[PDB]
Amino acid sequence: MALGFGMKMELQQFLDALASSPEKIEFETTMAVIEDNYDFTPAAFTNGNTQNDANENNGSCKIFAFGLLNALDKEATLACFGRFYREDVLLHPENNDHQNIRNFMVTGWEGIQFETSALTAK
Amino acid sequence: LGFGMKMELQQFLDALASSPEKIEFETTMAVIEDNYDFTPAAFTNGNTQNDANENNGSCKIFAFGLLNALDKEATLACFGRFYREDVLLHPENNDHQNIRNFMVTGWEGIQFETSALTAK
């Protein structure tokens, strides 16, 4: 478990929180929830004008796979990136970091295509 | 039907966007069959829980909606007559529980344990 023994981050509460106050969700929270609740396997995926091989950008891969399993809208999926979205990207539009976030902002779920699945529930 | 005949995904989505009431369940099932490998998956849908291999029609349609960025109403349209006739015209009946649940709670009520469709 991410936080300690006998301590697992509950999926439902996370999703409820994300739905209520997406702006308060941190990247480390999303990661704890994904790590605790899923088994990850790498997967290639395209994301508008960017393409990721398996094992490239595994963090983004996890978040989009999570967004698909949990039927998250574009705004909620972006919010799962926490400060990477809210600070790194939104405050600095001309930077070139987090290409997956920047691409998904443009083309959204329409632009996403996985070659295979990356997450299975525990 | 014939050898070498496959339903193209893009045209189905364009047709669904243009004239959703002309979409029929058979067409949706064919497009999913032609375009995806299906793996039974457990999922919850508001107040209903579906085991893997239970309610495979609903499992496929919801997975297909997510993969193709469909909103609630476009997804319901993929059920064709089962939504438009059986459910909408008969609020007192309790068939098609996945359609009935999704109408109320939408994508916020949907959670898949595993991915049901992978692109061919």
Nearest alpha carbon to residue B81 among B23, B7, B13: B23
H or E element at residue B13:
helix B9-18
Q: Domain B1-119 is of which CATH architecture?
A: Alpha-Beta Barrel (3.20)
Chain B contact set for A110 (CB, 8 A):
68-69
Return the percent helix, strand and coil in chain B, to nearest 5.
50, 10, 35
- Return d(Cα B120, Cα B103) in angstroms, integer: 29
Mutate to test the interface with B, among A72, A117, A119 (most CBs of B within 10 A): A117
How crowded is residue A119: how many other Cβ atoms within 10 Å of its Cβ?
Answer: 24
**CATH number for the domain formed by residue range(s) A2-121:** 3.20.160.10
Taking the C-alpha atoms of residue A30 and residue A33, their distance in angstroms, rounded to an integer, is: 5
Output the DSSP codes for chain A.
--SBTTB---HHHHHHHHHH-GGG--HHHHHHHHHHHEEE----EEETTEEE-TTSSHHHHHHHHHHHHTT--HHHHHHHTTHIIIIIITT-TT----HHHHHHHHHGGGGEEESS--EEE-
> Nearest CA to B114 among B64, B40, B33?
B40
Structure determination technique employed:
X-ray
Nearest Cα neighbor of B103 from B91, B120, B118 is: B91
CA–CA dist B3, A114 (Å, integer)? 28
Resolution in A: 1.8
Which of B110, B113, B114 minimises the CB distance to A71? B110
Query: Residue B76 belongs to what H/E stretch?
Result: helix B72-78
Distance of alpha carbon A48 from alpha carbon A33, whole angstroms: 26
How is residue B71 annotated by DSSP?
Answer: -
> What are the extents of the domains in chain A?
2-121
